[PDB]
Design a protein around this ligand. Structure first.
Ligand SMILES: [Mg+2]
Ligand SMILES: [Mg+2]
Ligand SMILES: [Mg+2]
Ligand SMILES: [Mg+2]
Ligand SMILES: [Mg+2]
Ligand SMILES: [Mg+2]
Ligand SMILES: [Mg+2]
Ligand SMILES: [Mg+2]
Ligand SMILES: [Mg+2]
Ligand SMILES: [Mg+2]
Ligand SMILES: [Mg+2]
Ligand SMILES: [Mg+2]
Ligand SMILES: [Mg+2]
Ligand SMILES: [Mg+2]
Ligand SMILES: [Mg+2]
Ligand SMILES: [Mg+2]
Ligand SMILES: [Mg+2]
Ligand SMILES: [Mg+2]
Ligand SMILES: [Mg+2]
Ligand SMILES: [Mg+2]
Ligand SMILES: [Mg+2]
Ligand SMILES: [Mg+2]
Ligand SMILES: [Mg+2]
Ligand SMILES: [Mg+2]
Ligand SMILES: [Mg+2]
Ligand SMILES: [Mg+2]
Ligand SMILES: [Mg+2]
Ligand SMILES: [Mg+2]
Ligand SMILES: [Mg+2]
Ligand SMILES: [Mg+2]
Ligand SMILES: [Mg+2]
Ligand SMILES: [Mg+2]
Ligand SMILES: [Mg+2]
Ligand SMILES: [Mg+2]
Ligand SMILES: [Mg+2]
Ligand SMILES: [Mg+2]
Ligand SMILES: [Mg+2]
Ligand SMILES: [Mg+2]
Ligand SMILES: [Mg+2]
Ligand SMILES: [Mg+2]
Ligand SMILES: [Mg+2]
Ligand SMILES: [Mg+2]
Ligand SMILES: [Mg+2]
Ligand SMILES: [Mg+2]
Ligand SMILES: [Mg+2]
Ligand SMILES: [Mg+2]
Ligand SMILES: [Mg+2]
Ligand SMILES: [Mg+2]
Ligand SMILES: [Mg+2]
Ligand SMILES: [Mg+2]
Ligand SMILES: [Mg+2]
Ligand SMILES: [Mg+2]
Ligand SMILES: [Mg+2]
Ligand SMILES: [Mg+2]
Ligand SMILES: [Mg+2]
Ligand SMILES: [Mg+2]
Ligand SMILES: [Mg+2]
Ligand SMILES: [Mg+2]
Ligand SMILES: [Mg+2]
Ligand SMILES: [Mg+2]
Ligand SMILES: [Mg+2]
Ligand SMILES: [Mg+2]
Ligand SMILES: [Mg+2]
Ligand SMILES: [Mg+2]
Ligand SMILES: [Mg+2]
Ligand SMILES: [Mg+2]
Ligand SMILES: [Mg+2]
Ligand SMILES: [Mg+2]
Ligand SMILES: [Mg+2]
Ligand SMILES: [Mg+2]
Ligand SMILES: [Mg+2]
Ligand SMILES: [Mg+2]
Ligand SMILES: [Mg+2]
Ligand SMILES: [Mg+2]
Lengths: 84, 52, 64, 96
RNA sequence: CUUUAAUGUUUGAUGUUCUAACGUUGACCCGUAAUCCGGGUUGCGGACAGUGUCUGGUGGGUAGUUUGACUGGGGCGGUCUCCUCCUAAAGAGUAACGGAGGAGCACGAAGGUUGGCUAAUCCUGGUCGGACAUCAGGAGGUUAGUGCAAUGGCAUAAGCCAGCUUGACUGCGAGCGUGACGGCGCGAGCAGGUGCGAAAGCAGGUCAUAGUGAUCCGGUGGUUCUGAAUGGAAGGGCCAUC
RNA sequence: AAUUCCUUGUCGGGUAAGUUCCGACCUGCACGAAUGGCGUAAUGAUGGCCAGGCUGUCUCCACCCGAGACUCAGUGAAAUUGAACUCGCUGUGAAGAUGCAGUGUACCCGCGGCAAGACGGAAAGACCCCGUGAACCUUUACUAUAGCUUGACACUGAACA
RNA sequence: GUUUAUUAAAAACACAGCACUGUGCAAACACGAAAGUGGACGUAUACGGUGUGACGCCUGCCCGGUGCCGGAAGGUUAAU
RNA sequence: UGUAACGGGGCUAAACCAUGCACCGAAGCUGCGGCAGCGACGCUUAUGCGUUGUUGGGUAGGGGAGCGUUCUGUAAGCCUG
RNA sequence: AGGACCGAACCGACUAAUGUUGAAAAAUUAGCGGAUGACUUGUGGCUGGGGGUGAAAGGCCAAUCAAACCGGGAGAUAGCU
RNA sequence: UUUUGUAUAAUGGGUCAGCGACUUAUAUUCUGUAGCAAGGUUAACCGAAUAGGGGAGCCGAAGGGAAACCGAGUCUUAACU
RNA sequence: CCAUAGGUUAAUGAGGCGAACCGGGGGAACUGAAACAUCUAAGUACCCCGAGGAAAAGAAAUCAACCGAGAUUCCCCCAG
């Protein structure tokens, strides 16, 4: 009689969470090959003993402690592995 | 899905083949690439054949 | 009476030395031109059954 | 194996391999089993008489497992490398 | 050899007639004291029909069943997988029929490498020429660009030109990330062989994140791995692939 | 209109007054010609409307006759039922209280009556939803199939063209 | 006239009548694995099915779809 | 439906604000006594004995230990007119 | 003459009231329809369950019918109480 | 009892007495216990017989690999740091 | 026409019942598959026919594997 029923919502979608972030923090001893940061861009940049992956993933090429540091004229954030 | 699939047969006599795709409308000419043949352990020209 | 073996699991799993089960990976039967060769190369070798799903296997394969 | 209506693991996963009929008629032999025969000679019929390998068996290897303390003629059987060295060191005579 | 005239049989098709199969819910006789049945004489039909097996069609006449879930009650409507942002509370993750947008590809170069270059817009002047083509200078300084959505990146350019090319390699892979699992991802380095570069070096697809589908069954090529007495083979297995 | 949503359509009639009725109009949401159209005498335990007579239908009930109800004697059930020493109110609270809190009121026990409550009794709600329930029915749902039909071979042969 | 025995007697069913259509007789059809039987001891002025529903005036257009009927040149097509 | 918007009576403080000392008030804590679990430590363990701490709400559920019943052996025994 | 008329038997069942643990697992009372016909009734017979029969309501088939009853498969199954 | 949650005006029960629901068989895994121990164990059957015999067989002391096959290693691979 | 069909006599036998087991002819569905149609249930239940104290089967056109065994039936393994 009266239940003016109706509507919808074109906005139901979303994607899965990719679990990005910093996996190993500073002063944190890692093995060689350990993923430090997963990220889209180069929000961070690779310093000493640190490689950049295909997806801008920062992994350790050697063993030692993680060092976050800011260098360069653009004040970019570099991640390096100190020797250990 | 216009990009059909083909195979790149070794010209070394082996039946080894890489599989790949191409647009046969815009690229009518055959694809020929020099690829590694793990049987002969050499780089040999492969040629386009049908995926069959 | 005897327990009957699930014959599919007997065709899919093999018991190892310490009691674990080896199995073939999935995803290596077709649709293979779009898959990276690294992926396939890490899918050819047999893998061990994980600790979580190892109980259902033992229930299906009582006779090893 | 019922996981709800989810495809169970034994059907998610592919079949592999086949079954060898020859493996059922092959056998492996300890070195410690070599003393359990009589006559100091080791054949298939000797091992079957000693109730070691079984009747339907037609092939047998001798494997470095255990140890033997006696000279034993081995005849018509495969022998591993370590079993050949241990038998020949213990006085054996591998032949055909 | 091209094209057949004769003869005959192997023979099909189409008629043509026949009778002997078969049919007769035609007549008459007998069993018989009987409108069944059988036998007999006979007439008509006649190899048709009709029955059996096989086979194509039709077939709710009958039978067995199926006909999804979420859902501010059910239905109708909308949705169902993947990607991007917010909600999301400065690690990760986090729901609603919450707010907004996209994907189900493309590229044999739009990949690799070497070398070089650096935008948008506006201002002034200038043949056709115009708000807006091309040209020169100046401001500006990435407000542009990125094959496509958004976000994050990008000048050492990941953006734009040209040269050479196929690393859009094969076997592996320490070690980590992520998931209940299946699984997904990153990966230095090792062996082989290769491309560019003088060289150091770089390259195991594309700036990244969507561009997808388990198993079974079956197909194709390769491989002696197996091969039900033996030798092969079929089939199967493994590798690649659909 | 047995069909008209809007609609108590509009006009007229009948009535003091008529969403019904009758007659017209046609703007037929969404009549219509053998799933028949329009009429139609008679008939109808048929539907709707009106009038006369009639009357306790009513205004508004009154009295009377009888059968019970009531009392005595005799026989003698039933549904139901956790236990009961079984009040009202306002509030609280599984959200509508005999039973909790606060307060008020109330000597104990019957009999005749009424039926507001005991979410009273009766019937594992028939509505609604659910169930990877059932049944029946339908069809251009799926898969089959009886049946009907086609042809091949057999029972089935001879001649001539 | 009939009907829901036990909440529905009606405008529902039936009806005489009408029309379409099938059926040539061993009829169609129906019950039956079949033999047989009904139709019918009847023979198209008969039988079956379907729709309509006395009577009166009437019953208009559409064959595209779905069915049915008829066709047989061509295409396609089974067992063999 | 009946005061019915302090729980009521009633209160001009028996209300509110500030400060302070008292007291009441729980199955909390302490005291006295008793049981059990788990750990220490030591004995010379009867593998449990002192001391010692500490623990002891509980559904689904998991673990441990028991009572009693009927029947068989012990039992042609023992109790019982 | 008449599926003619009024109206008892007979057949039926329109309305109201009672009753509804009834007198009665569908009746009584007062009225009601047909009543020479497509009537009604007695006795005997036939049709059987996916079947019958049906002036057709999914009606009836022993107080049971969108597929009777009884026995069996059978302790069907029950993600439900 | 079911529940987020019941004095609930949600379910069930009038009461008493009696009956009334996690069993049984065979396989398999784990724990405990007992026996033997790199061995352990027999089934059918025989046997007058819960003995003894019977070791057919089963599990275990070796695994890897799809497999052939190799073997304390093996597979992968042309070959593995 | 013989004949045959048919008729009649006579003799012998059968017929029916019954618990299970047995062989054969037919032959389900619920259920399970978390639906269901292949499949399962299950050649089960059930119906029918026939026999005996047991029946059935049975004396290799069999297995095996180049060595060999030597009818049938039953039990334990092989082996889930
Ligand atoms: Mg709704
Ligand atoms: Mg494959
Ligand atoms: Mg043995
Ligand atoms: Mg149906
Ligand atoms: Mg739903
Ligand atoms: Mg966060
Ligand atoms: Mg946070
Ligand atoms: Mg906030
Ligand atoms: Mg460059
Ligand atoms: Mg200009
Ligand atoms: Mg580039
Ligand atoms: Mg990109
Ligand atoms: Mg499948
Ligand atoms: Mg071979
Ligand atoms: Mg062979
Ligand atoms: Mg209308
Ligand atoms: Mg109206
Ligand atoms: Mg008026
Ligand atoms: Mg009136
Ligand atoms: Mg009118
Ligand atoms: Mg009409
Ligand atoms: Mg019409
Ligand atoms: Mg009448
Ligand atoms: Mg009395
Ligand atoms: Mg009583
Ligand atoms: Mg009250
Ligand atoms: Mg109240
Ligand atoms: Mg009273
Ligand atoms: Mg009352
Ligand atoms: Mg009363
Ligand atoms: Mg209910
Ligand atoms: Mg009648
Ligand atoms: Mg009647
Ligand atoms: Mg009735
Ligand atoms: Mg009535
Ligand atoms: Mg006839
Ligand atoms: Mg009609
Ligand atoms: Mg009419
Ligand atoms: Mg017409
Ligand atoms: Mg038409
Ligand atoms: Mg037509
Ligand atoms: Mg036709
Ligand atoms: Mg055709
Ligand atoms: Mg008041
Ligand atoms: Mg004070
Ligand atoms: Mg106290
Ligand atoms: Mg205490
Ligand atoms: Mg104490
Ligand atoms: Mg406790
Ligand atoms: Mg406590
Ligand atoms: Mg006793
Ligand atoms: Mg009359
Ligand atoms: Mg009467
Ligand atoms: Mg009359
Ligand atoms: Mg109906
Ligand atoms: Mg009845
Ligand atoms: Mg039935
Ligand atoms: Mg039925
Ligand atoms: Mg059953
Ligand atoms: Mg039951
Ligand atoms: Mg209860
Ligand atoms: Mg509730
Ligand atoms: Mg309470
Ligand atoms: Mg109460
Ligand atoms: Mg209660
Ligand atoms: Mg309930
Ligand atoms: Mg009760
Ligand atoms: Mg009991
Ligand atoms: Mg044990
Ligand atoms: Mg032990
Ligand atoms: Mg079924
Ligand atoms: Mg079934
Ligand atoms: Mg099922
Ligand atoms: Mg015999």
């Amino acid at each position: 009689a009266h239940k003016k029923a109706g509507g919808s919502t074109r906005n139901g979608r979303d994607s899965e969470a990719k679990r990005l972030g910093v996996k190993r923090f500073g002063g944190e001893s890692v093995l060689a090959g350990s993923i430090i940061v997963r990220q889209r861009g180069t929000k961070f940049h690779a310093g000493a003993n640190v490689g950049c992956g295909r997806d801008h993933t920062l992994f350790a090429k050697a063993d030692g402690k993680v060092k976050f540091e800011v260098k360069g004229p653009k004040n970019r954030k570099f991640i390096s592995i100190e020797a250990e | 899905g216009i990009r059909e699939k083909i195979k790149l047969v070794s010209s070394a006599g082996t039946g080894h083949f890489y599989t790949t795709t191409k647009n046969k409308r815009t690229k009518p000419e055959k694809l020929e690439l020099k690829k590694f043949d793990p049987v002969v352990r050499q780089h040999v020209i492969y040629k386009e054949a049908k995926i069959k | 009476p005897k327990i009957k073996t699930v014959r599919g699991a007997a065709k899919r799993f093999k018991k190892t030395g310490k009691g674990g089960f080896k199995h073939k990976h999935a995803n290596l039967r077709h649709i293979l031109t779009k898959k990276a060769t690294k992926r396939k190369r890490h899918l050819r070798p047999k893998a061990m059954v994980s600790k979580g799903d190892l109980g259902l296997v033992i229930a299906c394969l009582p006779y090893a | 194996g019922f996981e709800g209506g989810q495809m169970p693991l034994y059907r998610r996963l592919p079949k592999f391999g086949f079954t060898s009929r020859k493996a059922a008629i092959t056998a492996e032999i300890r070195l410690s089993d070599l003393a359990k025969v009589e006559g100091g000679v080791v054949d298939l019929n000797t091992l079957k008489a000693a109730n070691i390998i079984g009747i339907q068996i037609e092939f047998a290897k001798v494997i470095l497992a255990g140890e033997v303390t006696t000279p034993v003629t081995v005849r018509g059987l495969r022998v591993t490398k370590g079993a050949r060295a241990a038998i020949e060191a213990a006085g054996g005579k591998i032949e055909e």
